[PDB]
Amino acid sequence: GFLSGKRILVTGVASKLSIAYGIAQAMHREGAELAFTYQNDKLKGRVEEFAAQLGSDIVLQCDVAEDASIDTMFAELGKVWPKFDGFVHSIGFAPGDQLDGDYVNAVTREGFKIAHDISSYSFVAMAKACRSMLNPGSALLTLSYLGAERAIPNYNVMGLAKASLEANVRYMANAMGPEGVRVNAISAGPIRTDFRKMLAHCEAVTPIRRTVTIEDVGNSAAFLCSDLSAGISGEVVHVDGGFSIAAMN
Amino acid sequence: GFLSGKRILVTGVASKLSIAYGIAQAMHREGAELAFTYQNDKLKGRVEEFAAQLGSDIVLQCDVAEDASIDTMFAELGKVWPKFDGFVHSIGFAPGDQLDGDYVNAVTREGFKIAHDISSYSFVAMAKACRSMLNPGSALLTLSYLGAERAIPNYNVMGLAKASLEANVRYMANAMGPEGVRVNAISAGPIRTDFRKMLAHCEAVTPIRRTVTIEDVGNSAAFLCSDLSAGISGEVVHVDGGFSIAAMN
Amino acid sequence: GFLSGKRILVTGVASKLSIAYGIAQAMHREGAELAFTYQNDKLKGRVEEFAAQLGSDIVLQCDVAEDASIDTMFAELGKVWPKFDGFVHSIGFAPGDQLDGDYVNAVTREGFKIAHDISSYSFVAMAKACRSMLNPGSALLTLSYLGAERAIPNYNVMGLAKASLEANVRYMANAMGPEGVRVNAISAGPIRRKMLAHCEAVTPIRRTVTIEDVGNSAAFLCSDLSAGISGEVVHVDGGFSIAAMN
Amino acid sequence: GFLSGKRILVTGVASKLSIAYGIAQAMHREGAELAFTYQNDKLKGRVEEFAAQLGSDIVLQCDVAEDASIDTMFAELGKVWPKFDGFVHSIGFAPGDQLDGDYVNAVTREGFKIAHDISSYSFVAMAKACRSMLNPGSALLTLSYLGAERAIPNYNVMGLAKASLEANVRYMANAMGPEGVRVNAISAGPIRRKMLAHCEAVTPIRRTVTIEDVGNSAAFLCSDLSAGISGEVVHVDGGFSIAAMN
Numbered sequence: 001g002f003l004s005g006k007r008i009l010v011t012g013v014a015s016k017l018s019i020a021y022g023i024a025q026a027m028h029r030e031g032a033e034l035a036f037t038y039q040n041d042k043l044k045g046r047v048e049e050f051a052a053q054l055g056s057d058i059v060l061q062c063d064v065a066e067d068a069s070i071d072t073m074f075a076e077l078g079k080v081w082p083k084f085d086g087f088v089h090s091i092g093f094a095p096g097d098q099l100d101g102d103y104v105n106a107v108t109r110e111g112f113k114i115a116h117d118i119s120s121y122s123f124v125a126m127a128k129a130c131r132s133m134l135n136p137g138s139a140l141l142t143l144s145y146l147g148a149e150r151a152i153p154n155y156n157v158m159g160l161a162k163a164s165l166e167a168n169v170r171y172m173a174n175a176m177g178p179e180g181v182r183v184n185a186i187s188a189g190p191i192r193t194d195f196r197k198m199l200a201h202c203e204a205v206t207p208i209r210r211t212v213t214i215e216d217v218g219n220s221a222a223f224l225c226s227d228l229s230a231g232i233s234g235e236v237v238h239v240d241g242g243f244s245i246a247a248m249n
Numbered sequence: 250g251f252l253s254g255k256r257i258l259v260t261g262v263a264s265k266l267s268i269a270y271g272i273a274q275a276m277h278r279e280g281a282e283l284a285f286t287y288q289n290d291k292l293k294g295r296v297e298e299f300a301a302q303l304g305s306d307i308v309l310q311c312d313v314a315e316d317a318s319i320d321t322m323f324a325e326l327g328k329v330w331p332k333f334d335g336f337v338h339s340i341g342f343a344p345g346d347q348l349d350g351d352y353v354n355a356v357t358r359e360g361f362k363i364a365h366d367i368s369s370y371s372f373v374a375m376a377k378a379c380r381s382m383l384n385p386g387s388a389l390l391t392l393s394y395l396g397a398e399r400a401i402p403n404y405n406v407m408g409l410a411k412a413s414l415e416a417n418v419r420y421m422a423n424a425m426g427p428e429g430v431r432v433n434a435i436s437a438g439p440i441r442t443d444f445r446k447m448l449a450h451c452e453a454v455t456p457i458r459r460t461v462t463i464e465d466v467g468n469s470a471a472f473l474c475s476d477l478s479a480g481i482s483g484e485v486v487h488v489d490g491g492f493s494i495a496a497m498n
Numbered sequence: 499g500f501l502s503g504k505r506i507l508v509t510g511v512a513s514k515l516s517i518a519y520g521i522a523q524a525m526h527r528e529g530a531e532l533a534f535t536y537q538n539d540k541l542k543g544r545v546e547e548f549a550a551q552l553g554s555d556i557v558l559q560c561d562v563a564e565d566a567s568i569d570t571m572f573a574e575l576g577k578v579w580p581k582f583d584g585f586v587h588s589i590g591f592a593p594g595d596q597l598d599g600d601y602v603n604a605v606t607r608e609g610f611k612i613a614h615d616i617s618s619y620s621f622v623a624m625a626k627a628c629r630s631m632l633n634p635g636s637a638l639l640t641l642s643y644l645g646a647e648r649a650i651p652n653y654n655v656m657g658l659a660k661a662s663l664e665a666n667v668r669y670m671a672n673a674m675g676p677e678g679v680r681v682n683a684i685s686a687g688p689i690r691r692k693m694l695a696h697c698e699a700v701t702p703i704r705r706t707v708t709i710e711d712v713g714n715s716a717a718f719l720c721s722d723l724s725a726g727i728s729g730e731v732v733h734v735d736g737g738f739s740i741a742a743m744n
Numbered sequence: 745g746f747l748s749g750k751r752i753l754v755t756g757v758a759s760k761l762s763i764a765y766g767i768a769q770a771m772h773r774e775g776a777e778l779a780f781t782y783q784n785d786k787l788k789g790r791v792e793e794f795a796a797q798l799g800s801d802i803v804l805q806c807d808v809a810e811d812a813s814i815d816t817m818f819a820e821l822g823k824v825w826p827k828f829d830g831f832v833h834s835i836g837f838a839p840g841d842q843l844d845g846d847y848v849n850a851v852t853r854e855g856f857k858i859a860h861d862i863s864s865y866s867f868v869a870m871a872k873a874c875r876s877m878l879n880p881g882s883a884l885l886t887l888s889y890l891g892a893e894r895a896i897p898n899y900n901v902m903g904l905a906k907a908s909l910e911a912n913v914r915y916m917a918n919a920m921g922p923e924g925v926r927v928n929a930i931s932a933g934p935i936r937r938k939m940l941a942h943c944e945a946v947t948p949i950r951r952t953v954t955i956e957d958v959g960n961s962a963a964f965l966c967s968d969l970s971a972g973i974s975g976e977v978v979h980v981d982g983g984f985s986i987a988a989m990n
Contacts, residue, residue: 103915104872104915109869117857125853131848151911162911164860171900175847175849
């Protein structure tokens with residue numbers, strides 16, 4: 001398929017309904033060889049199993065909160081992939097109380113610091129750590145959400161972290177392009193897994209009249225990490241069925 | 250390939266260096282069956298030859314200035330493709346004196362009317378004319394340029410027509426989505442075929458450090474007309490190597 | 499006021515509720531001397547009523563569909579103001595058949611042509627026709643709508659004409675800035691029934707904007723207070739466009 | 745003036761050339777009563793010199809890196825102004841090691857943390873700490889830069905902090921608008937050597953903007969003249985960002 005020859009590391013695989021799993025499935029179907037991180041002991045087993053289902057036995061612990069953890073993960077990867085072609089960053093978090101109710105009341109200095117560290121800094125932390133390992137032609141990919149561009153109820157300090165993240169894509173694309181590395185994001189629509197009401201709304205007003213699926217997101221992610229997207233860098237691509245471009249439907 | 254099963258009409262094929270030809274080549278390589286329009290008698294022969302090189306003998310006259318011409322073209326197409334899966338609009342024109350020097354001096358009411366009629370109206374003219382022919386899952390694609398979003402010297406009334414065109418993508422995506430049709434544009438970077446100086450500039454400041462090629466544009470176009478981009482509609486995708494997202498390089 | 503010593507021509511005043519009246523009123527309050535256009539002779543006395551309230555008796559006929567009418571209107575204006583400091587463009591039309599129902603079904607080649615010619619091309623037509631009359635320090639302002647940026651049901655081909663108008667603002671600003679002219683627009687929010695109900699509920703400031711609010715931003719954007727702003731589409735819609743799923 | 749009967753707190757006045765001084769000056773000219781913060785005691789007399797020229801003796805210490813300092817600063821302010829009408833946030837910092845050379849090489853976890861905490865989080869920290877003190881009609885303003893939108897060489901991690909700041913503006917506007925508070929920013933152009941040379945040559949108005957131009961837009965954006973504007977990033981860079989390849 002259109003990723004044959006490519007080795008891509010996938011972060012954030014959680015369950016078979018997670019976007020990262022939809023991306024890993026798509027990439028695998030297109031011929032990539034994959035490697036996977038897991039955060040901690042609770043998730044290790046499920047990730048090993050899913051990795052093995054998609055032909056891989058490269059399953060490595062990584063906590064992106066820690067610079068040391070990122071480095072030793074890449075040291076391990078390099079024993080099997082001295083060079084590789086990019087990675088998929090699907091990691092985003094804010095403490096739970098950040099995301100409920102009025103933004104100005106909910107946000108705190110520490111909730112801000114964590115959400116930005118985990119959801120934005122970790123993308124460039126990973127790049128810094130594997131930079132010399134990336135072949136010419138590599139592509140980095142992160143996931144974002146409309147809350148970066150619009151104020152969405154409850155999304156709160158995650159909007160600011162995703163906005164930081166999308167500027168990180170541009171700064172990274174600009175810095176890394178001359179060595180032959182592209183860096184893009186997908187701004188994914190809400191995916192059916194307060195939520196019920198937001199989904200009903202979103203299907204009714206999306207031009208394609210349905211929420212995107214993890215398969216849809218996976219196919220766009222495979223494209224953006226393949227040589228087929230050689231012309232695209234620093235771009236936030238909306239994979240939300242046109243939801244963001246309509247108003248008052 | 251990822252377009253097998255798809256029938257796509259390609260407009261604007263001119264010479265082997267034209268974006269539309271790069272798109273038709275890419276689509277063909279991915280398995281689509283193609284049909285081609287030609288504007289007039291001068292171009293017919295070259296289009297017939299290129300069509301035949303990419304497996305097609307569907308070569309039909311169409312002048313998008315005329316509603317009658319569009320209709321009879323689709324009447325002919327329908328004798329061989331009673332239904333089909335979309336088309337690529339690569340048609341854009343302004344009278345030559347529109348594009349030289351100060352915009353406010355150069356623009357005229359008639360140069361404005363032509364550039365908007367040909368470069369923007371014709372996209373929805375084509376959609377209106379084949380709407381009932383499009384299968385669920387179809388995708389329409391047009392080409393645009395950064396001059397839609399920024400004031401670029403000399404591009405002049407073409408910027409306004411491309412801006413009209415990109416709003417046409419959104420209005421079309423919104424109207425057609427519920428019947429299962431997506432509508433997108435590619436905003437393509439300058440392609441190496443005042444021009445010399447603009448190219449040197451553009452390679453030096455583009456993150457990927459080169460101009461995009463018609464192959465790069467073709468691959469993104471194939472993606473956007475394929476089921477792989479099922480999640481994307483109403484979107485203007487930048488295929489300019491990150492050129493638009495950097496500043497002062 | 500912050501427009502003292504400014505002469506601004508105002509188009510599109512058709513009634514006291516119109517956006518262009520709210521703008522003229524604010525400009526007059528801030529010390530501008532005003533002039534007005536009208537299109538057909540039926541409206542002429544009514545515009546003289548308006549101009550009189552806003553301190554002016556410069557009321558001139560103009561049909562912006564015609565190059566010669568725009569030219570003769572600026573020759574007339576030139577008799578009272580051989581130089582002036584810019585104009586407000588508030589003129590936007592599509593035939594009514596364009597603005598109802600499915601966009602792709604509704605739009606025609608002629609409806610598209612009229613919408614762009616009248617709502618976008620007229621803005622640069624006016625600038626071309628008065629270019630040598632504008633002082634250094636001048637400012638041109640037009641009015642747009644969120645339909646330029648998003649697909650809004652029914653707004654249809656007007657969405658494309660306003661997207662052309664906004665690009666027109668940028669290309670005009672880029673061409674005229676070196677002579678010392680700025681060019682901007684205000685994208686105004688809806689102005690006061692299901693659509694207003696939605697709008698009030700979801701706009702950050704919880705109300706629709708008024709012609710007074712729009713008039714106040716326009717006055718700023720045509721005054722030297724906004725000397726650092728050119729080529730800009732300023733959203734005066736209470737924040738409606740930056741929110742989603744409120 | 746158009747700020748008569750307004751009380752605005754101004755942060756970041758460090759010298760007479762600073763953007764925040766140009767803003768305070770314009771606000772004072774338009775009739776606002778002002779208050780100022782300073783960070784360390786070394787700068788205190790110098791800020792009292794400044795405040796005195798702009799009509800004020802409300803000069804208060806605040807280190808926005810610390811929640812308790814922001815709290816005690818608003819308690820002090822509360823002794824003279826138990827209610828007031830908003831503030832200007834002009835505070836932006838990254839360690840100097842962040843702002844040189846290749847972005848990906850330069851940026852560290854700590855440099856990222858400081859840049860966002862000081863340049864973006866402090867804006868909502870201040871709002872949280874004075875929320876109940878703000879009158880209906882109030883306005884908060886911060887300062888950004890085109891680096892939030894585009895990758896500019898050397899600006900590095902500050903580009904990400906300003907992109908967070910701009911989103912902060914939208915989420916603040918959405919949360920505070922229903923209480924009657926607007927929140928906006930100005931993305932200011934560079935202010936007066938190779939980079940200025942480029943900038944003057946390619947900006948539509950053919951000059952860099954001055955602190956006076958920025959001060960005039962800020963005054964507007966904190967006055968009731970801009971009552972229709974919230975959640976908006978207004979570009980005050982002479983049109984530089986809307987042009988390409990000039």
